[PDB]
From TrEMBL, chain A:
Keyword Membrane attached: no
Any one biological process term the GO annotation gives: translation
Pfam families membership: Ribosomal_S8
Gene Ontology terms: cellular component: ribonucleoprotein complex; ribosome
GO MF: structural constituent of ribosome
Family listed: Belongs to the universal ribosomal protein uS8 family.
Domain of life: Eukaryota
Keyword Ribosomal protein set for record: yes
Name under which the protein is recorded: SSU ribosomal protein S8P
Keywords: Ribonucleoprotein, Ribosomal protein
TrEMBL record, chain B:
One GO BP: translation
UniProt keyword terms in alphabetical order: Metal-binding, Ribonucleoprotein, Ribosomal protein, Zinc
Binding site for Zn(2+) 2: C22, N24
Transmembrane segments: none
GO annotation, cellular component aspect: cytosolic small ribosomal subunit
An annotated Gene Ontology molecular function: mRNA binding
The family this protein is said to belong to: Belongs to the eukaryotic ribosomal protein eS26 family.
UniProt protein name: 40S ribosomal protein S26
InterPro entries the UniProt entry points to: Ribosomal_eS26, Ribosomal_eS26_sf
Residues given in the record as Zn(2+) 1 binding sites: C22
Pfam families linked: Ribosomal_S26e
SS bonds (residue pairs): C22-C25, C22-C76, C25-C73, C25-C76, C73-C76
TrEMBL record, chain C:
Top-rank taxon: Eukaryota
One Pfam assignment: Ribosomal_S5_C
Family the UniProt entry places it in: Belongs to the universal ribosomal protein uS5 family.
Name the UniProt record assigns to this protein: Small ribosomal subunit protein uS5
Keywords: Ribonucleoprotein, Ribosomal protein
Gene3D superfamilies xrefs: 3.30.160.20, 3.30.230.10
Any single Gene Ontology cellular-component annotation: cytosolic small ribosomal subunit
InterPro entries associated with the record: Ribosomal_Su5_D2-typ_SF, Ribosomal_uS5, Ribosomal_uS5_C, Ribosomal_uS5_euk/arc, Ribosomal_uS5_N, Ribosomal_uS5_N_CS, Ribsml_uS5_D2-typ_fold_subgr
Listed GO biological process terms: translation
TrEMBL record, chain E:
InterPro entries the UniProt entry points to: Ribosomal_eS21 (IPR001931), Ribosomal_eS21_sf (IPR038579)
Protein name in UniProt: 40S ribosomal protein S21
Cellular component GO terms held in the UniProt record: cytosolic small ribosomal subunit
Annotated source species: Giardia intestinalis (strain ATCC 50803 / WB clone C6)
Any single Pfam family the record assigns to this protein: Ribosomal_S21e
Origin: domain of life: Eukaryota
Key words, A-Z: Ribonucleoprotein, Ribosomal protein
GO MF term (any one): structural constituent of ribosome
Amino acid sequence: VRINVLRDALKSICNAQRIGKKQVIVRPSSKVIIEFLQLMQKNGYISDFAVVDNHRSNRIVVNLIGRLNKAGVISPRFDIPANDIEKWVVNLLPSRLFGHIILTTSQGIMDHIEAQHRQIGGKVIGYFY
Amino acid sequence: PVKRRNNGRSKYNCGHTNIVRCQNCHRCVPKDKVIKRFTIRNIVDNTIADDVLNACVIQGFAIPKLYNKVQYCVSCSIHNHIVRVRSREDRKIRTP
Amino acid sequence: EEWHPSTKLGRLVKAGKIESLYDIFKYSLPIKETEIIDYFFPKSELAEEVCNIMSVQKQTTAGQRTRFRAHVIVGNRDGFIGYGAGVSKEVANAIKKAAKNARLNIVPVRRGFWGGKLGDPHTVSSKLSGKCGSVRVRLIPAPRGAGIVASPTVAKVLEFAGVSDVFTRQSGHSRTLMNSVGAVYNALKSSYSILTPDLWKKEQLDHVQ
Amino acid sequence: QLKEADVKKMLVATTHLGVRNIDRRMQFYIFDRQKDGTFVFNLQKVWAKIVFAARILVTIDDPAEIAVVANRPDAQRAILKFCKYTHATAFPGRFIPGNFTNRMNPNYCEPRLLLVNDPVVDRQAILEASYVNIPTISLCNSDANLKFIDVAIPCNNKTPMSIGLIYWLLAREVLRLKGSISRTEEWDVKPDLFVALPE
Amino acid sequence: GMKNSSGVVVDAYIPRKCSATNRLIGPKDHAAVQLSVARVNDKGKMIENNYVTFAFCGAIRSRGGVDSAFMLLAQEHGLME
RNA sequence: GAAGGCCGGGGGCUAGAAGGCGAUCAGACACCACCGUAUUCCCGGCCGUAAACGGUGCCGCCCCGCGGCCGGCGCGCGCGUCCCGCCGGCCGCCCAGGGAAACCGGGAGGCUCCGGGCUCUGGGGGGAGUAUGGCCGCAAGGCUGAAACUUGAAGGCAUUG
RNA sequence: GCGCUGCUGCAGUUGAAACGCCCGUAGUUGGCCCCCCGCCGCCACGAGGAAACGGGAGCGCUCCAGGCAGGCCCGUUGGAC
Ligand SMILES: [Mg+2]
Ligand SMILES: [Mg+2]
Ligand SMILES: [Mg+2]
Ligand SMILES: [Mg+2]
Ligand SMILES: [Mg+2]
Ligand SMILES: [Mg+2]
Ligand SMILES: [Mg+2]
Ligand SMILES: [Mg+2]
Ligand SMILES: [Zn+2]
């Protein structure tokens, strides 16, 4: 059965980008997907998207502009100490200069740089670059 | 390794198929793996048909035929030149 | 006698119309003449090494027929590396063919900084991977002063390519030299085809060339 | 734009007619399928494609670097006339592999543009072109494979009437763009020449 | 454009980005090509010698679809309707 | 839960383990010819194994293109069991991609750029699916399942002769 | 060494390895949605509680392995954390 909506959405997006399309559809419209897409948009990877209501798990449309190379999830949400982030950074991202790791905290959804600035930790959702 | 995608038979959407017997050795073979040819021929061969017609009395008498189905196993078909061993590229051709 | 170019690129190179090899790489033109690379390297700055020499046999009606295969690399220790192979009945001609082929194909190696940006680049831009046969290679950026953490054979390639600090990981049957060198070569070749955000800037094309 | 003389020449040339089969990459150029099964193209779309291709061709300064390949015995005359009046190059007949990558071949050249009448008979050269950074333009029927095809011209490529007309129109347009012939006056050359005349 | 601590660039050269997929073109992408399209005078029939230039990567070319991408690009940069 | 096999009753034409007999052979108690018991068929009940194979676990998402067949539905017309689509199923070829390769491509893809959920199995070759225990079974046997000792290769796909 | 015990991070068509198939309990896993209330986990800070070892500030046992000294006009000389 369907479980991780975010994983299916990200996989569809990456497959569409690989053949250089411009528009995609994603059945689920969860809040977590919305925040993930908001962070992607603000950082400049996917530009625009819209949510299409239907009373039955609304659909969402997104636009592509290249740039994005990879994006995934971590299926069991680990717990990330505020001081234990460099190991995950090195293990997951290609370089320390660019890339964004998404953590969900008591202060909301943010990136590993922001949490490192506030010296707090939490749970990890995914990554992209 | 695998030599043929069909595994040497025509078996789709089933588990078991009825069996038959080879006509020259009487071996038991699955119906989807045996080699089949349909033939139609005259009872009297072609050289004596004219003599048969001249000796016949009925006017417009038509020579009756023979309708038979021959079934052979893999070993006997090869030994009697019913099929030929083909090259690796030519195994994928499916015309008569 | 003299070098009579057999190609439009060769003629343009003989003339002083083209001024840098980077001016060639930017448009992905195939190279067929070995004279083109010495013109840009008049003083023979490029190095050379012979990684391996193996003998291959073919069974025949009467005994065996033997042959020799050789692998060669070349680089100037500054962002340029090439790999090539050659096979012949005699060792020396095989080596000459391998050297010619290695010189023929050449690629630039992109380099970057680990954390602090001070001075010239000292390591690879980011994570790079290559695949040839069963062997896989991973190149990881490293801090300054870390040296080259790799086997002697791979370290030779990274030295001839002009790197100073890097971590490496290997997998598969690494005892097969050709495929290890090929995997590292492919990883290095991929370096300049990897998009990074600083290259997101939108540049209009140029009609000339 | 499209003029009555051109459309009438086309419909009497059976240029708008295609083939029973269709491809998902060529449905934009289709207007309707006849009851029998034959597909029908759009004349406006093909005319616009011809104009665009003519622009791309004239963008090349030296016409001698433009390649024309036609293994079809029907097109030989049209391609020869095309190169004669357009000062281009011809490779009629069999295409020797290595004509673009093997510098020791007697007929070795470094073209900048390649023209084809049908990939199925000429896609052997298309691969060669892909090896040497060469854009390609082709005449494509209703069903075709776009493998290294950059620009396609939807039209029938079997009947001589169709082939000669298309080449003649392309020559006319490129000449007009170059500035030799103004649009108002009809071109001195007739399409009947490009068509192979038996005996 | 990778800058140093002083903001000076240090990258050897900036390669090309495909006009359609915004993807980098490698030094060995031998199937990558670049074209140009002519601009036309107000009277027409004549060319101003200003050519808008495009480049498509090898992967998209093998995948097909270059034609439609070219059409949309032209309509974006040209009133070719 | 195939076939074979077992217990108790029926029935008894074909073929046919065992057995016998004639050839062939150096020998031939085997291949070939002939006769022929159990069995093969029915009822009730045990056994619980097969190359029980797609040698590919179940649920779920995205995915180049072409074509055939089966069932149901709908659309259009010039009404033909026409052609244009939808769902589900069985198939063939194949671009990318993957792989040691043969090859897969309705995944063996989206994976060293290496994290959707659940279950089971394996860790060089022999000894050995053996010994000793336990359970099931009328029995034949099935499930579970070592060690000592020995050994430097055994294997997979492909190339030339 | 060993990504040959694999959580990170193995393999399971052909090399060793998907139970013959179905049902099914413990067990594991479970679509979307409510703007602020209580509870569990979770993250951060804090208290409290032995030193040595380990990390680590300062001190030229002639250096060092070490030790907590030592200088004159020493933070209340110091031995912090
Ligand atoms: Mg065999
Ligand atoms: Mg079966
Ligand atoms: Mg039985
Ligand atoms: Mg099995
Ligand atoms: Mg893994
Ligand atoms: Mg193992
Ligand atoms: Mg063992
Ligand atoms: Mg096995
Ligand atoms: Zn028989």
